[PDB]
């Protein structure tokens, strides 16, 4: 049979995510927000008043198993620069998604120049209204392939937006068609 095989689902992760922010403080930060009223983990950054933002957040190593095409589903909120005072010239309404293939599942320092851009990510047609506040929760999906090393790291680069990442899910598609 067919379907999506999940390699990483950030919302299901039990314990620490193990993700690495660069800079360590003042850029991407883990923030728990209280939806029901159950606490849910997000990674947030909002330096929309500041120039020269280059805030990186990378996952830990993700195995590709036997798959060569991988899909990255991101659920996120993103504020309208128009709705924020005093951000003229510095606020952005996109962020960037990157990847880096590696046989090594415990990379320490990874250079910016090892990462390859998948796409610019923006709020678009797919969203739900949910959640205190009502959050506009966007869903964007990109894919990459063919991957050929044991696994890979994903990274999210913020260049001056007001963004909360609520979910990152990485998966591939099976194609075991039925015989008849």
Author numbering: 27 to 61, 63 to 158, 161 to 209
Pull text from the paper.
Structural analyses, drawing on previously reported Eph receptor structures, show that EphA4 in isolation and in complex with ephrinA2 resembles other class A Eph receptors but on binding ephrinB2 assumes structural hallmarks of the class B Eph receptors.
The flexibility inherent in these regions is consistent with their relatively high average crystallographic main chain B factor values in comparison with the rest of the protein (for our high resolution structures an average of 62 Å2 in BC, DE, GH, and JK loops versus 31 Å2 over the entire molecule). While ephrins generally exhibit a low degree of structural variance between different bound forms, structural analysis of EphA4 reveals distinct structural differences between unbound EphA4 and its ephrinA2 (1.7 Å rmsd over 166 equivalent Cα atoms)- and ephrinB2 (2.3 Å rmsd over 168 equivalent Cα atoms)-bound states. Other EphA receptor structures, including the apo and ephrinA2-bound EphA4 structures, on the other hand, are more distantly related to B class Eph receptors. However, inspection of the EphA2 unbound structures deposited by the Structural Genomics Consortium (Toronto) indicates that for these crystal structures the primary EphA2 ligand binding loops (JK and DE loops) are partially disordered or are in conformational states quite different to their bound forms.
